[PDB]
Every structure is written in structure tokens, then in C-alpha cells.
Enzyme design. Sequence first.
Site, PDB file in Angstrom:
ATOM      1  N   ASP A  73       9.057  23.065  47.480  1.00 50.68           N
ATOM      2  CA  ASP A  73       9.917  22.510  46.433  1.00 50.68           C
ATOM      3  C   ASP A  73       9.221  21.504  45.576  1.00 50.68           C
ATOM      4  OD1 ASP A  73      12.493  23.775  46.765  1.00 50.68           O
ATOM      5  OD2 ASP A  73      12.810  22.667  48.537  1.00 50.68           O
ATOM      6  N   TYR A 104      20.373  23.428  47.696  1.00 47.65           N
ATOM      7  CA  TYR A 104      20.081  22.316  48.658  1.00 47.65           C
ATOM      8  C   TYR A 104      20.168  20.947  48.056  1.00 47.65           C
ATOM      9  CZ  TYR A 104      17.111  26.104  50.326  1.00 47.65           C
ATOM     10  OH  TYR A 104      16.641  27.338  50.598  1.00 47.65           O
TER      11      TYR A 104
HETATM   12  N1  ABN Z   1      14.206  25.812  46.902  1.00 46.18           N
HETATM   13  C1  ABN Z   1      14.192  26.946  45.999  1.00 46.18           C
HETATM   14  C2  ABN Z   1      14.721  26.560  44.634  1.00 46.18           C
HETATM   15  C3  ABN Z   1      14.529  25.297  44.131  1.00 46.18           C
HETATM   16  C4  ABN Z   1      15.023  24.935  42.874  1.00 46.18           C
HETATM   17  C5  ABN Z   1      15.691  25.877  42.093  1.00 46.18           C
HETATM   18  C6  ABN Z   1      15.874  27.152  42.619  1.00 46.18           C
HETATM   19  C7  ABN Z   1      15.378  27.505  43.892  1.00 46.18           C
END
Ligand code: ABN
Lengths: 655, 654
Positions: free
Chosen positions: B302, B388
Site C-alpha cells: 500500500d 481498508y
Molecule cells: N490495498 C489495495 C488498494 C489500495 C488503494 C486503493 C485500491 C486498492
Amino acid sequence: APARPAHPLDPLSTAEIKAATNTVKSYFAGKKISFNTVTLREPARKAYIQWKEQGGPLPPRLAYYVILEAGKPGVKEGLVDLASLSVIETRALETVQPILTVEDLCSTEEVIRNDPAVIEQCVLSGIPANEMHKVYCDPWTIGYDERWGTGKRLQQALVYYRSDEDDSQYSHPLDFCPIVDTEEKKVIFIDIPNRRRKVSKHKHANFYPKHMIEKVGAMRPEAPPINVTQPEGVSFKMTGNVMEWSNFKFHIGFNYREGIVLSDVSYNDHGNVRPIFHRISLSEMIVPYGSPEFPHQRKHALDIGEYGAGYMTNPLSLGCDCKGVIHYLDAHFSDRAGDPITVKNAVCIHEEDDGLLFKHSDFRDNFATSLVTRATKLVVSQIFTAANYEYCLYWVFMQDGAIRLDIRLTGILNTYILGDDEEAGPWGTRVYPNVNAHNHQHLFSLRIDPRIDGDGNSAAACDAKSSPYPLGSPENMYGNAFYSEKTTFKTVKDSLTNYESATGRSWDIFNPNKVNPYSGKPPSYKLVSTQCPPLLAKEGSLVAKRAPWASHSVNVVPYKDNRLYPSGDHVPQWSGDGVRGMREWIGDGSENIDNTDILFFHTFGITHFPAPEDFPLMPAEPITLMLRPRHFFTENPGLDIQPSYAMTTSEAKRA
Amino acid sequence: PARPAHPLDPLSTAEIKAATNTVKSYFAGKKISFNTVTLREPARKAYIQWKEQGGPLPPRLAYYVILEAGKPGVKEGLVDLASLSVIETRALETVQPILTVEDLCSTEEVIRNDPAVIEQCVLSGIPANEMHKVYCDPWTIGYDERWGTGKRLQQALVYYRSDEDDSQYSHPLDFCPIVDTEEKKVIFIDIPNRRRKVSKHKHANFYPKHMIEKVGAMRPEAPPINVTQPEGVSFKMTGNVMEWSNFKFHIGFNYREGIVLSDVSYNDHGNVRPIFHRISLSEMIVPYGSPEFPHQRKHALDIGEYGAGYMTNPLSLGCDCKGVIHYLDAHFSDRAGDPITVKNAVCIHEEDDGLLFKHSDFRDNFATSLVTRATKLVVSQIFTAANYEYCLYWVFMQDGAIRLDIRLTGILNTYILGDDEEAGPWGTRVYPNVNAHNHQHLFSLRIDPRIDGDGNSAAACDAKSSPYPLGSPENMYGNAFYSEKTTFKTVKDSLTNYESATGRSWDIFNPNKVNPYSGKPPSYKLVSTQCPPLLAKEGSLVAKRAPWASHSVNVVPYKDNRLYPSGDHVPQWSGDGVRGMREWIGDGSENIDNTDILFFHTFGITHFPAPEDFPLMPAEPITLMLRPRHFFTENPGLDIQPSYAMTTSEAKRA
Ligand SMILES: NCc1ccccc1
Ligand SMILES: NCc1ccccc1
Ligand SMILES: [Cu+2]
Ligand SMILES: [Cu+2]
């Protein structure tokens, strides 16, 4: 004849203690007795449940007692039926020694101050015989010494010296250890080293404001305050000892030995009130020191069984220990004479801010769409003092259905004297001139009586594993496959298991008779605990034999009434030989523990290698474990709590 | 521009503008867009010279990355702000850069209008005219060996909403469109062999209006718990410089790492002592654990693929930071080279933290007693990575420890599950037709230590029983035990994992100095037990793109610009080649004893989802701590006023 309480798990009232002692005194008329323990004998598990849920017989209100008799070795113990004021069960135990009360500990100092052999040792150490009022000691149980066994009731006086009564004595340990007969009130021996070391000539290492002003010039200015107010009151409800908060219900008990006992824990799942635990507490400890030199092998305190987390507990209100809108409970014990004593505000209950419970925002309208719910936690806490040490205990209920034990260790290091030319290492640290703080471990035995969504539980170990199939096979083309390997314990032997970093191991306590309708897994509370030291004392050592529970992070045995204390009922001076406590309950490791009434004993704690930061008074050191609902609910149980802030997509478009 | 006060300050909006005008004019006549425009931090040596040795004020420099239409890869370089010139440049034809907010925003429109996508939706049971109901999360493709870095690619994880207010995750679709980011065009769709149509069940929602339908009513509003500071706060900010409880440090922020803590010192009674030069999170990986195609491409890094700065939430609107808060704003470039601002991206406050220390004498019934209460300083941000939530709290404490606390929340990544389909063993059926796959969340903490000054080393500390057996003269009773310290000599020595069997901890220490009492070197001790092994196998895509993740600890020599352990440009690297941590490790033989070092710690958790986690997850905690050990000669907190104190002599007088 005493009024029975609101609730069968309620501790003995002062009136019930007094009634008990009167009854026991009469039974033993003409005999010179003293009271070591007068405490609730809790109702059998089956009876309590039958009373609580099946309209069943009300259980007998019982006081358990331990006494000594002058001139008789050992103890007597028994039960008083409180309704009929009689003794219904009795035995003499001539080869055990019992927990040491506050009265046992306060005696010993004046004994060594008046002993000509100790005075002479003080003179040889550089303290004049007319200054014995300046020699202090921490009167430990001897713990175990093979020279006496349980033949006499003994304490070992760890001796220190204060230049002024306000000094913190621990910068000034002396080199010798008097062995005192607790009941005769006499020094029977002094352990004296080969290399004498006289009392330190350095200034005492002090920590009150007057002391810091001299040591560092001035105190830091008073910080601007943080105020916490609950102007509409608290969200929790107490009815006697019974707590209700955020769907949790349970009974807050207390006793001389364990301190806080949480019973009959359940959660109200939208009108369906689901059992979680029948009983949960700290059931024993061991603090083993790691210097091999004589007589330091006798420092491996099992604080709960030899002194008592109840008996040692601090009154909480004067100290500012619990900040905010607080509910207090008092503890009631017996003294040596049989009179009720009270420790006020032994237990403090409050709720606090616990940060975020959950948050989610949508990137599509730039987090305009957002929901944010804050977390509140319920704290039930006590703090106890074991001579030099402080143990802060916080039982914590959380809004996701989780329950957490938080501990903070503070207070002062145990210290022993160090010669100018002496190296502390490898077994200890020189934390101040002439001061040796020995290495040690603090280990705790959490006892869990589970009732996960009802009766018939089991336990497992859960280990994260890579798929067995290799990288580039059809089953695992890119090497990334992993799962949770669940090992259900069938017999007691299967459960004897240690925490394992290489698998990020957790333990489940679960109900095999039930199934989550979404996931298809049994409902469970998952033990998530990584502060699990192995026992560094060797097998067959005195430490390992006296704490057979501590050599495994997890021990799971069949439920039986009165299996509370895993190093035995009467801990001081037990050699660690014989079938008792955990060793007895494990037996030959063959009994079933799958889908039955079980007890789960969990060893956790820390390994402490002291450093100057810890001295003269140590900064709180945190320990923690959690029990999380996993597949117990079919969804996040906190969703019906009002968000702090909420905007939907359609509301955001409108603005 | 004007120079800022402090050389570690982030780029101002003016300075970003200045940066992008300069790059515009140097590439005059070319269509270029901006991907990153950000501070290039001065060399550590330049900085320390300016700070302590009278050295000149380092040049204010901007790092940029750009794409040019019709040209593969990127161009990157440096702009000298004071002379508005480009001073360094170079073209990387075979990498792909971090995905910005805008590169993400256009994908849904691309897939909603694409005819093969539209056809896939119809066969999945959603009509061609209900395409406004189809959503996606637009991930990097991460890595796919069918295209390498030859095109800039995203993979659209597709979902369905009945109502715009639904949470979409109860309704994933079965197929995965691959999108060319720069051509705005779908080039492929991964379609499984067994088709599964959109769930018929209601959405699993979590707003109060949904909950009212689902369980009857919300809980009554609880009685408030209010936090005031009538006299204001104990901390003091000067620009981005923080002073609190003798700590001093600079709070920075960038698009990738989010919060960056620099120049950390502690004032030990007038002696100002360095601790860290810089500390921050430098990369992540979130490896999913289902072996089936195309899910091996779920392993988001990320920080390097999207940016913890680019992804960060404005705080304050939600009631995210309770109390008396100081906020900082973030500044970035958008695609056209104009400054964008995220308001309130960082929050700063102080909170109660229980007891700092306490001790009472049993001799007078605890009447002799001292109690002092703890206050902690929190510097935090929260970022959103599609589904998330990552809440980051850097915490300073009055015993001189620094902690990092993380709370994970938001929503499970989900994929469709058939009626008869078993999710185990790679995931959990958390709702009907919803498979929530196993995954780890891993973080790379980057420490540039400067423990009591220059010239540092690192060690492993392992509790061990004495080697002498029970019954011998040396360990009569079998209880002796000690801490074995293993000083790392060369890079290879450091590559170490957390070990429960020895309760392993790691020391970062100054071997040129010595504690007068204990005779040990001054140290901060890394205490950290949330240290999962990487479950992906050796030689796997995961293990190759995140070479730092395979060990809890990796110590390598300092060089400037050694920031990002998965490489500078993370999306679509296959993991082959000598870059990042793999480059810094080298052959393993370089010295790390008593020199300038970098200490990269891997920690986090392995997540086996459970229904409790759906449709919105309760905060899951992760922490690690760095504790002064042999750093001071006594508890540094003793000069803080007790909340209560009574001496033995005072107790008698009462
Ligand atoms: N963790 C994958 C992700 C992050 C930001 C935007 C889309 C997908
Ligand atoms: N941990 C030993 C101890 C406790 C209380 C009093 C003396 C000694
Ligand atoms: Cu300790
Ligand atoms: Cu997760």
C-alpha cells in the site's frame, strides 16, 4: 444466623466472617488458635447453574477456614455452614504451611532488630548496634529450603538499611539473610556469604519531590490538566456486585488470594443472553530469580499463593489511581484473632474512552461518505503491593465482545548488595553503586472456567501454515496459499502447548455442539496472547516443580469442584514433590477434555533484565492478553451503537 | 520561492507550483502529467552539519515523477527551487509509478462503459442499463506476467450496489477486468471457469437506518465522557517542530510514508541527547492466501503502490481525534501540476495514559505512598486503501519510550462464493455468498538511529538458561538465566526473526559510550512481538516483491536515498533484480558495527476472517515499542509532580 447475601457468589460479609470465627472458636474451645484465612467456599459449579437457570436448590452458604494452633505443626482447615453455625468439615494438615497474612509479615522486622546474632551481623556490616532501628527487612516466605522442609513455619528476612525513615531502602541491601521461625518469633539461622560486603556508603537512591529537588535542582512545573467528566453519569449499572454494561453481565467477586474474580459472564445478543465464562481469575504466580548463587535460589515468589493479591491489595481512593467517575468495592477479611477487617476501595470500576471502535469512508466522494463510531471500555481494577513490587491489574470489557487482561508492573526492583570490585553480570545488573538487581521472570496463571454459548466446551491450538503444496504446483501456483491449522485437544496431554512465534499461535475455546450459520465454525472465544515466556528454570528444578503449570503456556484439564490453585492449596515450603495442584489435575494426561466441562490455565508474563531506568522506582511495564469472540456472532456486534459521525452517499450528494 | 524555516519541512503549495512550472518549461512543447512532486530531503551529513556544526543551509529541492503521453514508463528528477532549474533527470522506461487519487477515480467510468465488461455484468445477472449500479475498487494489477511493466495496468475488483448507500462488499462479481490506466481502456477480463452470478441476498449494511431495519433500533445514546484542558496543553509547536516532556523532533509528512519523524532528541537535564535521525513506515505488503487465479495478484504494497499520504483522511469531520488537537495539513500535486491540499491530515494531541509509576510501603499500611500519572503524546493519521482503514498513532511517553500503535478497521476484501461453494481453507464464509480470503498485513518500520550520537550498532537479545545443568556447582538449583546478546557484525548477521523460544528483542546501541552504573552501552530496545513469518513461499511473487518481509529485522549501511525497501517504483515490478532491500543487502558482507546504519523491522498480523469482522470490522490492534535501556542512569520521570505523595515522616504527623 447471619443474613445471607443478595447473591451466592457474593463474598462473605463482615457479619458472616464473625459468625464463622465464633463457630470455629467454639468447636476448638480451650485450644489456642489463630485465623489464617476466612473466606467464601464457592458453591459447586453444577449447583450454582441449577440455581441460576433451572429453578434449582439454593446452595449452602459456606465459609472456608484455615487456622493454626500454638504448639501444633502445620494447619487446620475446614468448612463452616453459616445458616446452622456449625463446622461440617475438618482436617489437620501437619505438613504444609499456609499463606502469610499482613500480620505475619509485620512481626518479622522487630524480631530481627532484637536478635543478638543479627545485631552482631549488622555491626560487622558497618551499622552500630545502637542504630538497629535503621535496619529494615522484607520478610519473604523462605519459599523452600531443604534444610527445614515444612517442619517449621519460616521467613527469610531480606535485610536493608535506611539512613532516614523517608529513604527508599533498596539502594542499601545488606549481605546476610536471617531465617525466622514465624510462629516462635525467633531467628533460627543466618545465611552468611563467604565474601562479606559491608553496607554501602553512597547516598540512598531517593524519589520523593524533596529528594529530586536535591538530586536534580527542581521539579518540572505542574502540567496543565486533563479533566475527565461524566456530567450525565455512567452507562454501566451495578446491582450489588452484578455488573451490566454494553450487553455484558457478570458478577464481580473478590477474595484474599486471587483478588478480583469475575463470574457468570454473559452477553445479551439482542435479547438472547449467551454464556461466555463461568469463572475467570488469576489463580497463581511465580517470580523466579535467575542468580544461581546461594541463597538467591529461594527467590521465586508465588505471590498469589504465599501472600495473596487480596491480602496485599491497596486501598485505591487516596492515591488518584483511578481517574474519573468511579464505583468502588471494599474487601473484607479475617484477622489473626478472627475479627473482620476491611480494605476500603479495594476494587475500582469505571468506563473510559478507548479510541476508535470502527471507521469506514468512501474514496469515491472523497471520504464525504463516512461512518465513525468511538469505543468505550469498562475497567475493573485492583492494585496490589508485594513488598518492593506493585502489580496493577485491569480487567477490560470492550464493545466488540472482547475481554482483555492488562497488567502494569511498577514499584521497585528487588536488590541485593554488590561489592566495589564485583561484577553483577551475567545474572543481574548494576543499577546504582553497590546495588545488584537480579534477573527474573514474572509469570502468571490465568484460570478460565469456560461456558462458551453454554455447556460442553473444547479447546484447540490454531497455527498459521503455508499450504503443504510446493510453489508452481497446480494447488499453489504462486506460492501464496495459507491456512489456519486447528488442533483440537482430545486428552489433557494434547493441550500442554506453548506459544509459537513461527505459527503466530492462538488458542480457541469453543462449543462443538453449536455452529455459526454463516461461517460453519463452532462459536469460540480466541485467546490472543504473545507475552508467553518459556520457563527458563530447568526441568526438575525447584522453580519448575513448585509451579508445574508454568512450564506450559496452556494447560487444559477436566473440571472438578475446588480446582482453583495450580501449585496446591498450601503453597509456602512445598518442595514441589507429590501429586497435587496442576500435577494432580494433569494426572497421566489421558482424561478426555473434548466437549466436556473443562478448565484452561494459561501461563503468561515477562522476562525482566533490569536496567538503571528501572531504579530507584520503575516506570510501568505493560502486559496484556485478549479473548476475542470469533464465529460467536454472525456479524460485528457493535453496529447498533450510535456513530459519532455518519454521512451516507445520498446525504453527501445533497450537501 | 521563500525558503521555509526548517530544511525538513514538506514542500509548500507555492513551492510545488514553483516545482511544476519549472518541469513544464524544461519539457516545453510536451504533454506531460505529474505523478509525484515532493521534497527531496537533504543528505543526512549536510543536515547534521547545518544543525550542529555551523554548516550551510541545505538547498531546497523537489523530487518529481512525470509521465509523457505516448512514452512508456516515467521520467523522474530533481528541481533546484531557488534557481527554478531542473538539476537532474532521467527516463525509466520499464517501471510503473505509484497510483494517484485521479488514476484511481477514472477506472469505474472506464469499466461501466466498456462493452465486454457490460456483457460480463449481463451474464452475471445485472442488466445493461443498471451499469450505474456496478462499482469497482481499482487496484494496481500488482504483478501479472502476461504484461510485465509494458503497459500501466489496474485490475478492477468488481462489486454491485442495490442502492448507492449500500456497502458493496456483500456483492462482489466473479470476473476481473484489466484496465490500461493511461489509454482508459479495458484490455482483458479474467473470467473464471465456473461462473457465479450476483448474490440475491440483501446487502449487508451498517448505517443506523440499516441497523434500525435489521435489529429494531439503535442503542440509546450513551452518557458523554468529556475531555477538557482549561489551561491548554503541555506541548509546544514551532512550525513543524514539537517540544514535549523533554523530547524534541520534527513532524514531517509526505505522499508515500505519510508521517515522518525526524531529528528526535531527548533533553536529559540540559544535555540534549540524539536518539533517532528519522523514523517512519517505509513500505507494506498485504499478501492474500488463496492460491486460485487471479487472486495471487492480491498482495498490495500500500505504501509504494498508492501512498499513505495520498490515501490519508481529513480528521476532525469524523470525531476521529477527541480532546484539544493541533492539526497539520498535507500538500501534493495533482496531474496538472497544481497544488492540492488535504486539510487536517495529521493530528497532534496529549492524553491520559494511566499510571507512570507508584510505590507504597506495607509498613504503615500503604500510608507511605507515591503515585505519578502518565501522559502520552500522540501524532496520528488515518488512511483509506479502498475497503481498508489504517489508523497510525506515533506515541511518546514520559519514561522516554516511543511506541507505534496501529488500528486496522474498515471492510474485509471479499470475493463471491457460490451456494454450494466451501470457502475454507483459504477464506471464511462471513455472509451468504461472501468469501473473505485469508491475508497477512505486514509493515516495514524504517529506523535511522543516532543513539546518543554517531556510530551505532544493532543486536539480538535472547533470554537463555545457563548452559550449566541442574545440580552442578555453577547452577545448583537450575534457575540461573541470562540474556545472550548477539552483536550484528555484517549485514547477513542481522537478518533475524522474532523468536518466542527466547522472547527475542533487538538493541540499537552506541558502542562508543557506556552507562556509568551498569557498564552497558546506551540503547533503545525494540520490544515487538507482532512479527508473523511471511507465509508466502521462498521464490513466490510475494517473497520476491517484498524482500524485506521475509525477516523481522534487516540492518544495512546508511546511504542517502535508502528509503523504499521494495524499490522506488513498486507497481508491476516482478521482484527480479537487484533493487531495494535486495540491493542494500548485497552479498551480506558489509559492516554494520559502529557505523551509520538503517534498521528495517517487519511486523503486523495474519488475519483469518470471522463473521465479527463483517460487514464493518472492529479495530484490531498492532503495537511495537522502543524503550530506553541503559540510556539513562535512573528513571527519567522522577522529576514529574506526583499526583499524590506521602512520606513515612508525613504519615506519622497526620
Ligand atoms: N490495498 C489495495 C488498494 C489500495 C488503494 C486503493 C485500491 C486498492
Ligand atoms: N514477592 C515476595 C514478597 C511479597 C510480600 C512481602 C514480602 C515478600
Ligand atoms: Cu521485574
Ligand atoms: Cu485483515
